[PDB]
RNA sequence: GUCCUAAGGGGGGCUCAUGGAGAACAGAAAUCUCCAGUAGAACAAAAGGGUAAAAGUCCCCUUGAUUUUGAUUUUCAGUGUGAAUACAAACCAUGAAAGUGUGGCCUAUCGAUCCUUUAGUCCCUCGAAAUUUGAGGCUAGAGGUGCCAGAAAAGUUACCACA
RNA sequence: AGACCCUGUUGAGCUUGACUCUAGUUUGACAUUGUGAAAAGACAUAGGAGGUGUAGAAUAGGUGGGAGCUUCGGCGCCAGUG
RNA sequence: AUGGCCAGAAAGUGGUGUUGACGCAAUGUGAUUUCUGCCCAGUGCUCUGAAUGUCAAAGUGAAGAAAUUCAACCAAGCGCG
RNA sequence: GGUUUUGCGCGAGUGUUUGGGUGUAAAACCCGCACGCGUAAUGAAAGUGAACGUAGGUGAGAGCUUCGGCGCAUCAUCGAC
């Protein structure tokens, strides 16, 4: 994989997706990821998390699960938060976990609380995919925020389909190039044998055809 | 049926008759009927007799703290130990059956 | 075929591997067989060079 | 590393953990006395209803460590007075007695200087040089014959021969 | 210095699913090996059509974006089951 | 008979064979008279009847940069019937 | 071809005789390069490589002594590289 084919097909789809039809939300730039030389049904699931260099989902929430101080920090920093005292009042209640993780998006925990979570909550967030990041007392929670939402993750399911929100239109094209090929520089180092294990890679917004570059 | 008994159908090996597997043999030196084993069984012979002749190399080879009057029950224990090691095998095994 | 061995006669028969067996078994001949057979041999006691008994005969045992 | 007339069984007597109030040393914590104490102690199991003049704890007696018989059950027996096994009956132990209870539990064996396996990034070498696989060496770990490999080179000679 | 008995790192003849081999036999492949026709199976595409164990519009490929699509009839998140 | 039974290190080699089922070869029993304890189907004898179950070499496909590794396909016999 | 002991030469060296020169001719005499063993060990290997001290301290120890001690070989023991 070369560089000025993955520039055009990040401006063709920037072309696409601005003046030839543009919605009335702001769209996602998406990197969907088909995988040869390998099956997850015989060898171990590997997994991986990345920061990109811009956050990718402009449009998605966040739930912060921690103390009173936690709770003053996530008002600081303009984020919605809920307390532990509110976790015992759910207590491992399957329909009001399957709510909250279809709504919320993200999840940061406390060091001090993230223990009481599989007490609780038990392994319905990491069974969603939206397991609490872990954050410190004394780490900025903007920061940590910022972290969360430039972070996308390579698990290996049992399929070989793989999706990952790169990107949104609404960034620039040099932006949208840094994630795309921080994103598949840290998928080929997931990877044992690098690009030898690739098997195709597309580039699409939310409304828009797809690019190939693989 | 456990792994011994499938070996002695196997290897054509009989059941040993009640009057040959009993707790009792004849002592010829004391002149005396004792216990093959169990409490004073003939197993733990001179654990507490007053006098043991040791040898120089065993001695330089036993470990410190340990003494000669355990090494009769150090062996029982282990003999006990791999019985049960077969014994929960066997029934593992059956319940897996 | 399979082979005309003895260790391919048991694999075919699908014997235990690993088992003791006496001197003697073959196609012909079980242990119960063999020793049947042995008894009619049996009955010579074991004797140095000068022929001194350094193992009595069965059933002589001295 | 020390201790035991073993455990088990039968019978009888007693009630525990804890709290309150009392007693020279004795003072939260030593022992004794009373009261209250559904077991909150102990003993087995894993109650969502185990046990209180007991299934707990101490005394008395047995301790004989695996009885005898069977034409019956199951398996076996080139050593067929049958053996092992199940069941039954008798015996036995205890108790004044009604009764209660015992007359076993298991298992192929062999290596540990062995077998299987893992790691080395900043360990060494692959001898014309370099890189990447690979291989060998050296070092350090893990586990233990279910998933630690394997463990099948017989006879006969009255046709004979030699030392 | 026979015969008999005893011993052997014993010798030799013979037998047999004893061990390891082997003559013969049988089967396949390559070559010798040239000139022409005709079938069948398997993989690939250019693709088309599907997919209920239970619950649950749907007979649930799954995965990632997604609350909006909208060709103007409406389809949708939301509600419910997994 | 492009056969059987043999032989030879092999051969454009030999025998049976100057042979052809009333023949050749291999067995067992052993003149004549008598004679087939009764019934099967475990071992064995033979059936190209379906299977790929086992399945060698050669050949085919995939991965890798290659050494190499992994897959099917897989004759006879064995296995099943 | 080893190993221990005896005698001999030389001695941190030692061994002329594969070969050359020479000869009164298989003798004797002479010559030297390389090489063997020894002079350094250890490590699988890459590799590294033996003085703190009058080449150390303590107790013995023949012999000598200026009669205070100096102390061979060797032994035990603590150190150093």
Same mark, same amino acid.
């Given at each position: 994989?070369?560089?000025?084919?993955?520039?055009?097909?990040?401006?063709?789809?920037?072309? @696409?997706?601005?003046? +030839?039809?543009?919605?009335?939300?702001?769209?996602?730039?998406?990197?969907?990821?088909?995988?040869?030389?390998?099956?997850?049904?015989?060898?171990?699931?590997?997994?991986?998390?990345?920061?990109?260099?811009?956050?990718?989902?402009?449009?998605?929430?966040?739930?912060?699960?921690?103390?009173?101080?936690?709770?003053?920090?996530?008002?600081?920093?303009?984020?919605?938060?809920?307390?532990?005292?509110?976790?015992?009042?759910?207590?491992?209640?399957?329909?009001?976990?399957?709510?909250? &993780?279809?709504? @919320?998006? &993200?999840?940061? &925990?406390?060091?001090?609380?993230?223990?009481?979570?599989?007490?609780?909550?038990?392994?319905?967030?990491?069974?969603?995919?939206?397991?609490?990041?872990?954050?410190?007392?004394?780490?900025?929670?903007?920061?940590?925020?910022?972290?969360?939402?430039?972070?996308?993750?390579?698990?290996?399911?049992?399929?070989?389909?793989?999706?990952?929100?790169?990107?949104? +239109?609404?960034?620039?094209?040099?932006?949208?190039? &840094?994630?795309?090929?921080?994103?598949?520089? @840290?998928?080929?180092?997931?990877?044992?044998?690098?690009?030898?294990?690739?098997?195709?890679?597309?580039?699409?917004?939310?409304?828009?055809?797809?690019?190939?570059? @693989? | 049926?456990? *792994?011994?008994?499938?070996?002695?159908?196997?290897?054509?090996? *009989? #059941?040993?008759?009640?009057?040959?597997?009993?707790?009792?043999?004849?002592? #010829?030196?004391?002149?005396?009927?004792?216990?093959?084993?169990?409490?004073?069984?003939?197993?733990?012979?001179?654990?507490?007799? #007053?006098?043991?002749?040791?040898?120089?190399? *065993?001695?330089?080879?036993?470990?410190?703290?340990?003494?000669? /009057?355990?090494?009769?029950? /150090?062996?029982? /224990?282990?003999?006990?130990?791999?019985?049960? *090691?077969?014994?929960?095998?066997?029934? /593992?095994?059956?319940?897996?059956? | 075929?399979?082979?005309?061995?003895?260790?391919? =006669?048991?694999? =075919?028969?699908?014997?235990?591997?690993?088992?003791?067996?006496?001197?003697?078994?073959?196609?012909?001949?079980?242990?119960?067989? !063999?020793?049947?057979?042995? !008894?009619?041999?049996?009955?010579?006691?074991?004797?140095?060079?000068?022929?001194?008994?350094?193992?009595?005969?069965?059933?002589?045992?001295?």
């Amino acid at each position: 994989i070369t560089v000025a084919g993955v520039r055009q097909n990040v401006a063709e789809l920037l072309d @696409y997706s601005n003046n +030839v039809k543009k919605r009335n939300f702001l769209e996602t730039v998406e990197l969907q990821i088909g995988l040869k030389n390998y099956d997850p049904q015989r060898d171990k699931r590997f997994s991986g998390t990345v920061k990109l260099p811009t956050v990718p989902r402009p449009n998605m929430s966040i739930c912060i699960l921690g103390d009173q101080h936690d709770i003053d920090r996530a008002k600081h920093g303009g984020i919605d938060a809920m307390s532990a005292d509110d976790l015992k009042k759910l207590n491992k209640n399957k329909k009001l976990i399957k709510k909250l &993780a279809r709504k @919320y998006d &993200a999840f940061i &925990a406390s060091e001090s609380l993230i223990k009481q979570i599989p007490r609780l909550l038990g392994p319905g967030l990491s069974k969603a995919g939206k397991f609490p990041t872990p954050v410190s007392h004394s780490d900025d929670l903007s920061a940590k925020v910022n972290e969360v939402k430039s972070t996308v993750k390579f698990q290996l399911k049992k399929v070989l389909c793989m999706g990952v929100a790169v990107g949104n +239109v609404g960034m620039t094209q040099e932006q949208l190039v &840094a994630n795309i090929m921080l994103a598949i520089n @840290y998928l080929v180092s997931l990877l044992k044998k690098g690009w030898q294990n690739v098997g195709s890679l597309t580039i699409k917004a939310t409304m828009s055809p797809p690019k190939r570059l @693989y | 049926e456990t *792994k011994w008994q499938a070996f002695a159908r196997r290897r054509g090996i *009989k #059941p040993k008759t009640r009057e040959q597997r009993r707790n009792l043999q004849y002592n #010829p030196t004391t002149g005396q009927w004792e216990r093959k084993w169990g409490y004073k069984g003939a197993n733990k012979r001179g654990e507490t007799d #007053p006098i043991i002749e040791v040898s120089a190399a *065993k001695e330089a080879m036993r470990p410190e703290g340990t003494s000669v /009057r355990g090494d009769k029950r /150090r062996e029982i /224990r282990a003999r006990v130990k791999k019985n049960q *090691k077969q014994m929960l095998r066997n029934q /593992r095994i059956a319940a897996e059956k | 075929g399979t082979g005309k061995k003895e260790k391919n =006669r048991l694999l =075919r028969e699908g014997r235990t591997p690993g088992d003791p067996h006496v001197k003697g078994e073959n196609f012909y001949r079980s242990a119960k067989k !063999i020793k049947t057979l042995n !008894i009619l041999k049996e009955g010579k006691p074991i004797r140095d060079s000068k022929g001194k008994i350094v193992k009595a005969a069965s059933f002589q045992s001295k």
